[PDB]
Enzyme design. Structure first.
Site, PDB file in Angstrom:
ATOM      1  N   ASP A 106       8.025  -1.845  -1.835  1.00 46.94           N
ATOM      2  CA  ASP A 106       7.946  -1.792  -3.292  1.00 46.94           C
ATOM      3  C   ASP A 106       7.973  -3.217  -3.835  1.00 46.94           C
ATOM      4  O   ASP A 106       8.791  -4.032  -3.404  1.00 46.94           O
ATOM      5  CB  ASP A 106       9.134  -1.027  -3.868  1.00 46.94           C
ATOM      6  N   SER A 111       6.070   1.177   4.009  1.00 50.51           N
ATOM      7  CA  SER A 111       5.646   0.635   2.729  1.00 50.51           C
ATOM      8  C   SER A 111       6.702  -0.321   2.190  1.00 50.51           C
ATOM      9  O   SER A 111       7.823  -0.406   2.685  1.00 50.51           O
ATOM     10  CB  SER A 111       5.402   1.756   1.726  1.00 50.51           C
ATOM     11  N   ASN A 158       4.767   0.764  -5.267  1.00 48.97           N
ATOM     12  CA  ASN A 158       4.760   1.089  -3.848  1.00 48.97           C
ATOM     13  C   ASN A 158       3.405   0.835  -3.187  1.00 48.97           C
ATOM     14  O   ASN A 158       2.350   1.158  -3.737  1.00 48.97           O
ATOM     15  CB  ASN A 158       5.143   2.560  -3.678  1.00 48.97           C
TER      16      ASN A 158
END
Ligand SMILES: [Cl-]
EC number: 3.2.1.17
Length: 127
Positions: free
Chosen positions: A52, A50, A59
């Protein structure tokens, strides 16, 4: 863009964050300081694949969709790219959903570690 402290406080207040779900405005300003250093284009990749995104470091596994994160849930129903705008609307709207999900502002690691327990009202003092 890089917001000033009081500049961001005023914008966040116009967008309804002051006292939202129990969190006074200084919490949100402190969170942004330590999440993104007030830069609407900050991005950080994580070990789980992932990333941010933006002023509040939202996220891409749970909250926004970036098309490249396994296990994506897109609970804010927003492309992550929208969260890199200099206009904070999409990030605030998603933050409101995050903070309503049941664990308050604990979703923001920098807030948990560097804001919670301090006098957060200092972040709006003088504005
Ligand atoms: Cl102080």
């Amino acid at each position: 863009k890089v917001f000033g402290r009081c500049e961001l406080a005023a914008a966040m207040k116009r967008h309804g964050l002051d006292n939202y779900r129990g969190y006074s405005l200084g919490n949100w300003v402190c969170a942004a300081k330590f999440e993104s250093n007030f830069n609407t284009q900050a991005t950080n990749r994580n070990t789980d694949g992932s990333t941010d995104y933006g002023i509040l470091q939202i996220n891409s596994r749970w909250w926004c969709n970036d098309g490249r994160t396994p296990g994506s849930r897109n609970l804010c129903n927003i492309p992550c790219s929208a969260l890199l705008s200099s206009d904070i609307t999409a990030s605030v709207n998603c933050a409101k959903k995050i903070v309503s999900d049941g664990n308050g502002m604990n979703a923001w690691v920098a807030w948990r570690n560097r804001c919670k327990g301090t006098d957060v009202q200092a972040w709006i003092r003088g504005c």
